[model samples]
Structure formats: structure tokens, C-alpha cells
Target chain A: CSQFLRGQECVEECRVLQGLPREYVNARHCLPCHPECQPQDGSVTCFGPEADQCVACAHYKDPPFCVARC
Target chain B: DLGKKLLEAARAGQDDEVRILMANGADVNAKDEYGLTPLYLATAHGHLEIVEVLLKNGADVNAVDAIGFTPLHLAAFIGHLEIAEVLLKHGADVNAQDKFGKTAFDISIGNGNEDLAEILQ
Candidate 1:
């Protein structure tokens, strides 16, 4: 797994397990994403346990933080 | 035995044998120990007819081999535009990444298959 930080999530370069974002605390192991970050919510990954810390949004991409539905 | 035969037939472009094996209840999605399904083999070998046959028999279009390389990836890597088109029509994921983080689109670009890159994008 190529290691990189996408927000607080440990995003692997490989797409095989792309759905499961790893925790920032333990980058090697996979972990369920925090409730604040969800694809539907436009938050792909977050720097912290809040929705405001999103690295990028699926849509609208509100600059560093993602706000759903524009 | 049936699964192995189907894999071989698809790999060799033996359409008749592939049909016979499928008719005999061979699993279209059966994988070898290396996780290579009939469609994967057919696509990798550039067997368009066998690829079509396997898809018609319900082969998984997005099935990945041992290294997580999808048949679409192979098609792009080999610059098989027709096979890539067929796979796209069947809903192959263009954005799917192999173990190396390379998508079919990425492979096409790197391999200089401009036509395929356009189609994939």
C-alpha cells in the first residue's frame, strides 16, 4: 500500500480497498471512516473527527472543507 | 475439470470448446488458482471472440486477477480498442485501479494509446 494522507485518512494508492479508508492513528490497518466523513455527505476524508476538516469533497469542493448539496 | 477446460479454451481462442464447456455447465466466472477467470484470460490473450463468448455466458466484466488487474486493464495495456469498447459497453469500470494504482485510463496514457485514453476518459 502506497502511503499518503488524504485528510486524516490513510489513503492507499491502490483502488482494491479504496472504499475502506484507514485511520490516521494506524495507517497500516484498515478502519471504518468516522461518521462525519461519508461519500454521500460529500466528504471523502477529513483531517479530524469533524465534517469541517475534509480534504476534499465529492462535489462542490468547498475549499478544504466540504459542505453537502452546495 | 470443466472450469479448467473453459479457462484453456478461452485462453486459446477455441470458441467451439468454450461453448461446449459452457454448455456443459462450466462456470463463466471460475478463477484459476491465480484468480484468472475465463474473461480475464480471453482479454489478456486478445481473443475477442472468446471474450464475447465469455461475457455472453455471464462472465464478470470487472473480475480482477491475482494482482488486481481487471480485464479492462489488460485491454488498455495491449491497446485492443475493439475489446475495450466491448468491455465499456458491458459496464467495465474505467476508473478501476490495479495493485499498482494504475487505472485502464492510466495504462492507456502511459502506453501511448491515445485513442484508448479518450475512450476510457
Candidate 2:
């Protein structure tokens, strides 16, 4: 297959993240993975590319955001 | 547009057209206005080859329509036993319930397909 599964949507391999990232034409473009997260910030997935869009914190259970505990 | 064409081909049993759409970048998981996927449409219309193609292309086997009707639910409702078997082999959830809390087995029983119900069980 020339396309690959990304999340629940199929994306063309050549255009997985090609060109401008904000095109959002396909569902693949609409969803992003870890573009704004800091190293070891403890995030599995995010609602968007923003770190603030984290769905769950990997290490800390911070209610509003995910941060590495000091 | 390709996704919509895929849905039409899947529902109409146009296997070659369905493949062409998929190869041409149709969204396999694309949903209709009713939140129904191509898999659901194929199962609802008893298009077994289309169902297989959609599944192989990563179609959501457990996809739910607006009424929470899964492809498996439609398969059982329509009494397509072989289609149900293919879905099960592809990881369809037999226990998946609709918004009405009816499982595929429940639909099979209601539809009086003892053979289908047995497989679901």
C-alpha cells in the first residue's frame, strides 16, 4: 500500500508531514504528534501539536498540565 | 471526494471502483453524514468483497454510525453469516453494543439466525 495508517486515519506516505504543517486537509494533517513538547515532559499524546494539548501526563499527574516533577 | 466515491462504490458493490478510490487516496475511515464508514455501508448492503477491502485498508471494523450501529451489528441484522465471520477474523468486537444496548448476538437472535448467534457466542 502506498499509504500508511496514522492514528485512525490513512495518510499518503509522501505527504505524511510534507509542506506546510497546518494544511489540515486530511484527518492525518488535522492530528499531530509531539511538535511542542519538551524533552521528558512526560506526554504520551496531545490534542494538538502544542504541549498544552497533552491528553495524559506520563510521569506526573498534574491536573491541568504535564510537567516533570523536580 | 474520493472518500465519498469509495462509500458509493462500497454500498453499490463496485469492488474495482472501491479499489480505485482507495488506491487514489480515499480516506478508508471516512464517515458519511450519518457518521457511517465504508465498512458499515458494505456490511449493511452485504458487499463482502468491499468489506474485506475496506478492512485490509485499515477501515475501522468497529466503526459506529450515528445510531451506534456497528458494522457487525449490520452484518448480524442482515443475516450475512460469512461476512460476520470475516469481520470477526479481522477483530470485530462481538460484544459491541449499540446505543440501544443491543449486541450483534442480540440482533442475530432477534432476527432468528441461530447459526449467526452461535458464531457470535
Candidate 3:
């Protein structure tokens, strides 16, 4: 946890600064730590982020900005 | 101006042209009207070598466009995994949300690009 306060801030992962020093552009970046999955098969349905949309479309975007479930 | 020409060269994927302009004094971090840098344009087009040079010359990897899009968002949006890896190696945010608050993972998943979503994981 020493390297962050982090992740993709646009290019924010490697360059934005504060107390700790970043070596360069290649220094540090963000990676996903959790397994957040929304499964989808060819026969699945989902439409959009709306909870109800998952039923109408082949893929569904879950939260306001979450993963899509197919 | 070197900045404009640099953007043109970077967009053209002419590594030699980009380098020559930078060597003659273009700002590696220069921004165009949309607040995009040469690195931004290079990345959007998947010009890996050009992206490399900009990084080496000290371009701001996290530069935001007028709409708050990053090179990472753009690269992943295109499903350019090779270029995406390069950006990540250079420090891109796989989880970054775009103007719509959408992360690359979300975008990739929504787009059905499991390979990229796996990279996000």
C-alpha cells in the first residue's frame, strides 16, 4: 500500500505526485485487486446500466459505472 | 510550430518525423487544442514506438484531454492490447473512468473484449 492513493487517473497512475517520489514515467501503475465479474453467454441478454436493462439486452452495465453482465 | 508539427508527425506514425521535431525543440508535453499531447495522439493511434519516444522525452503520461480522456482510456477503447500493455508498463490506469465514468474494464467488457478485460484484472 506504500505506492498509492493510486491507479488510472488518465495517465495519473505513473506520474502524479506527492510525498513519495516516482522514478519516472515507467515507475508505478494500477492493477485490479478484486474479481468483479458479470458473466455473459451468446444466449444472454442485457441492455444498459439500468438494473432492468439486463433483461432486455445481451449485455448489461450494472452500476452507475460498473461492469457489464452478458 | 514544433508542437503542431510534432502532433502531426505523431499522428502520422512517422517516428522519424516526430523524433526530428522533438530534437529540434518541441515540448514533449505540449498540448493541442483538446488538451491532448503528442503522446496522447500516438497512443490513440496505437503508435507504440512514437509513444515510447514521447515517454523517453518526458511527456506527461497522465495528460487529460478536453473531455478528461486519457491515453489509457483511448488505447483500451480501441482494444490495442499491445499498446495498452505498453501504456500500463509505463503506468496507465486500467480502472480509469472516462467522461462517462466508465473504466477500461467496463468499456472492454461492454465491448466484448475479454482479452482486454483480463488485462484489467
Candidate 4:
């Protein structure tokens, strides 16, 4: 099995996100956002957190950026 | 109301007034008589500063007006490249079509704006 790099992981189930395009067997890899969602607050807001945070990827916080769910 | 005044301030490129309106309970997405949101008004008139204020307040960049034309559609039609850039960066739908089924890229091309079409595509 190939490993998920950069904190990448498979979201075998997602109640909110549509899941990322890149996937593995029987599961889709988690993504920071959907095609519609994107990082908006930029550096000015990342130090803490905002409502803009992706629901599925809420666990990972790169500070002002998001990532796939943990 | 504050929303109406915000529209006028945005149309006039009055950044300070626009900010004040937002503070006074002005809906950033409020539409005027022509279904023109503050975002649409600012983008249409090349008021980049006002556009930023509206966007920060949760403006929908891809919002359509009464004519089914989005702010990007009007911005490209007027050759407002910088305004278009901000809208796109904010996730404006570049391929959104108007009532005539014409997209922002389509309008830009018909208006002889090859550069705008190139980036939109």
C-alpha cells in the first residue's frame, strides 16, 4: 500500500466533504476543501481559526491554511 | 437604509463610507433597484477598493443580477482586468453564463479583450 504523504489520509467516510479526487482502494483521500471551498482569510487570520475552516479537515491546522482530516 | 447608501458609496469609490455602512448593519450582498449587489456595483465601476470591502464582508463573487449577468460578466465586458483578477481569486465563476448563454470569457472576446479571455480560460 502506498503511503499518504504530507499528512494525507483516507477519509473512509465523510459526512460533510465530497472528499478529494485522489484516492486509494475503496476510499478517497481527505482534502482541505471541496472544489467550491477555498482558503480565503489568508495570513491575516490563520494564527487562530475562523468559521472558514473546513469541517472534514478541521483537525489539521497549518495555521491560516487547512488540510485533509486527521 | 445603510445598504442603499453602501451601494452609492461603492459606486462612488468612497472606501471610508462603504466601511461605515458595513459597520452600520449594511448587507454586503444587498441588491439595488437593478439587482446590483454592492460587489457588482463596485466591480462594474472599477472600484477595486470598495470591492475588497464588500468581499471581506461575505459578498458572493459569482452572484447574478436580474439579467443573469454576474459581476465578472460585467467586469470583463468593461475590460476591468484588475477587478476581474480579484473576483477570480475570490472564486468568481469564470464560466458563468448570462441570459444569452454567454460567459465572462465570451463577453471579453466579443469586446476585443483577448487578454481577458486568455486568463479566464
Candidate 5:
């Protein structure tokens, strides 16, 4: 049988790979250049190398103003 | 006698008697146990003339009862377009908050009354 992982362990693993000061890495920074990022809010999340670890960033206050840098 | 007279006058859309009641020490802000004032009752029932009379006599336009519902809130909530128009014309706070911290527009949307919501806008 396969081993089971705890929720806390999964979060810890994701955090390590994502890095710290999540604001610098979150995907929301691409909003200004990407048309798809228009109308960003709590409903949307992006996944990619360009995307930052917004989920872990304390600086990401108010998703509406988060625009992507070209 | 006072309650009977006031209720009758309001029911009959008697603007004169309503004015008289207000002049003769009747509580314009008085509400029943249900938190309904004469103005609230009149507006909810679509008595446009009576609503106008009550407003003219200084009825609290934003007065809310236990349920946090103001006269404007009820008017908008019930889709009373004319009454809503009159209230807005007379400077009723379009954004007055209800007991639930919602404005008239919020109530209109909650009730699915798009017509009232547009009027609020």
C-alpha cells in the first residue's frame, strides 16, 4: 500500500518549493500585460513559473490592484 | 379613538386628516409592536398620496424598525416604484443601511426586484 500524507505536510512541501515573501513570486504580477488577468479577485489563481506564491505572500492585499509587469 | 381616527384617515388616503393628526400632537414616528409606523404601512400598501402626506409632515424617512428596515428600504423592497421615486425626490437616504448592514439596493437585489434596484442607482 502507498503511504498517506497529512494536510500540514503537503502545505509545508508546497511552501518550500514556492519560496518565501510570496509577493515577489505570485502570478498576480502578470495582470498588467495579460488580458486574461483582467477582473482579478479572490476567484482566480494562476499556476506557472511566472506566477508567484501569492497564497504564501502577506504583501498581496487586495487582488484588484495586482498587475503583471511586462 | 386616536388610533382609530389615524388608521381610518390613512386607509382612506385622507391627506388633510393626516396633516391634522401630525399637527395635533400625534407621533409622526410612532410605530406599532411590529415596528411599523403609519408611513411604513401607507407606503407598503402603495398609497402614494398618503406616503407623500406623511413625508411632508416630517415622518422619519430613514426610520427603521426592529428588523432594521427603513421606509425607503420597504418601498424599494416591495417594488413600489412611485413611492420609491417620491422618497428619493424628497431626499431619502438612498444608501441608508438596514439592520443587516445592507442598503436599499442590497434589499432590492436580495428580493430580485431589478426595477427597484435601477431606481436606487
Candidate 6:
């Protein structure tokens, strides 16, 4: 049988080895399935009838929102 | 008759008579045979009192005759500081460009009147 360690991990070592939040191990572990983790511009394009209030994807970053009158 | 009297009064610097004529329904915007208004003739001749009187009687400060010259342009060109000031105070467009694209400032500077040019600027 093996005995368990008694001393706790230090805060500095925990921060360096684990991460700042300590809950997330790394970004690679979180971004593989969750592809929404990216920067995006705020604009609306179109929406289908079922989901009439369609939301814009957060990954787009070009062509600013229209502000001037035609 | 009215044009002759107005011109004579303007030329003679008779401020009171000019006012009386304007009050008695004399056309303040009347142009003479040379296409010059009484205000224009008065300003061209450096008649400050007459110019002021005509301006008070609602003369077109920016009235351009056949030659494209306003009272302000004529006064500035002739280096009449007092008359120019009066015209300016009475709402003359300083940046009014003439037919030759020359403003009152241009005419003043072209005439080598630096003081007048400075005042216009």
C-alpha cells in the first residue's frame, strides 16, 4: 500500500503550474469543442423565420456597421 | 429728378437731405446712368457721412453695379477706413469675390494699402 502526501501545494507553484484562475487547466482543453471562443465585430446580417432574431457570429471583424443615410 | 437729387445730395455730403429723400420714398437702391448707386458714388468719393446715412437707410451694402463693385469693395480699394468700417458693421461681406475673383481684401492689398488689407483681414 502507498501513503498519501501530507504537505499542500504552494500558491506560487499552483499559479505557475496550473493557471491564474486554477479552474481552467489551459485554453487547448477549452477551445476544441467550444469554437465560439474568438473576437468578433458587433453587427447583424440576417435571420431565418424559425429563429427570427438570429444572432451574429462573434468571429467576424470587417465592414463596420452602417451609420450614414443613403 | 429723384436720381439727380440723390446723386447731388450724396456728392455734396448732405447727410440730412439724403435721409429726408430716403424717408420720402426715394429708391435707396437706385443706380445712376453709370450703373452706380448713390451709396456707391458716395463711398467712391470717400463721403463717410453720406455713406453712413445711406447705409442707415437700408442700402444694399453688397450691391454690385455693372462693373461688379460693391460699396465695401470701393471703400476698401480707396483706403477709406472709416467708410469701410461702417460698411463692415452694416453687414458687408468681406469675402465677396468680384467678377475677377478678387475680393475686397485682394483690391486693398493690390493697391499697396497694407493698413486697409490688415483691417479687411
Residue B107, model 5, lDDT: 64
DockQ of 6: 0.00
Off by over 4 Å in 5: A1-70, B1-4, B7-20, B23-25
> Where is model 2 more than 4 Å wrong at Cα?
A1-70
Computed on C-alpha atoms, the DockQ of candidate 3 is: 0.03
Docking quality tier of model 1: incorrect
Candidate 1: which pairs clash? none
Give per-residue CA lDDT, model 1, range B30-53, as digits (tens).
877566788977775567888888
Candidate order (lDDT): 1, 2, 4, 3, 6, 5
Question: What docking grade does candidate 4 earn?
Answer: incorrect
Instruction: Write out the backbone clash pairs for model 5.
Output: A25-A52, A25-A53, A26-A52, A26-A53, A27-A51, A27-A52, A29-A68, A30-A68, A31-A68, A32-A68
| CA lDDT, candidate 4, residue A43 | 9
List candidate 3 stretches off by more than 4 Å: A1-70
lDDT of 4 by residue, B40-81 (tens): 777655688888878888998888865466888866655667
Q: Residue A9 deviation, candidate 5, in Å? A: 63
Candidate 4 lDDT, tens digit per residue, A10-63? 322221111233211111122223322333211011111233433223346564
lDDT of 2 by residue, A18-68 (tens): 232321112212344344332211111333444454444445645565556
Q: Write the per-residue lDDT of candidate 2 for residues B9-120, one digit (tens) a residue.
A: 8767899999988889899998775566788878765678999999999999888765466788766655678899999999998888866688988867755667888898
lDDT of 4: 0.60
Model 1 share of native interface contacts: 0.00
Q: In candidate 1, residue A44 scores what lDDT?
A: 18
